[PDB]
Amino acid sequence: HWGYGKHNGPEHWHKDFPIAKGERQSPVDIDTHTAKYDPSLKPLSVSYDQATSLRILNNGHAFNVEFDDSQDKAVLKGGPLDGTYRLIQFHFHWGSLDGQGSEHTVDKKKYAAELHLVHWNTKYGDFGKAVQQPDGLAVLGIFLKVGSAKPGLQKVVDVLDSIKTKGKSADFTNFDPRGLLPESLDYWTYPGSLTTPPLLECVTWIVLKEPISVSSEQVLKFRKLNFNGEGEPEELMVDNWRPAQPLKNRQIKASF
């Protein structure tokens, strides 16, 4: 079924998920000159102090770190949002080379990877109900550039070896997501969708201005993952990103 290869890649998704051609699809190019500064946007409130991570899983398209979302432990509020959004998982999209891998681009600049911390609106009771709503999810996206190593990232990198293939998971408790944030919380925001099937248009996207840098040996580890399951032919998990979709009459507001 879907994936990122020539035969089942982004350009084929519309056949099974017609919403791929919809009106608020993601990712988009952020054009910094056309984004409107909106001084009514409140500051973001990232409360990741009580975060409880549980495990890391290679799901065949990325690896996800799942968090216990049964109580308001790690939440996002403020910014463009109304209400409390709970952290449920985070994952990355990366490239086969350092010049590609982000999903969102800024003035057409692609970064080496992009981190998505996925939150759902607690108003709706569970994640499944939240993906039925136009303001059901908020994903915080952070660009990664290659430079110095990110200390907070290394714990994830050291575990990727035990989850090499599709369907492996490993326990991964006590990871603190705060070590993945940039210094500044300045952002662009716009209404959008999930960037992988089922491509539902449930998401308020918050994309931070400031990228974090990771080393080349750290992103190199990402690239060793496999799309396939154990015993299947090896396909390296690289380039698991969707190209920018048309903005078609949405405006990207900026908090700065």
Ligand SMILES: NS(=O)(=O)c1cc2c(s1)S(=O)(=O)N(Cc1cccs1)C[C@@H]2O
């Ligand atoms: N790339 S991205 O940030 O826009 C996201 C992709 C996926 C996300 S967020 S999800 O965890 O919410 N989930 C979506 C759903 C699961 C069940 C019903 S819909 C898995 C998706 O692959």
Ligand SMILES: [Hg+2]
């Ligand atoms: Hg929706």
Ligand SMILES: [Zn+2]
């Ligand atoms: Zn994503």
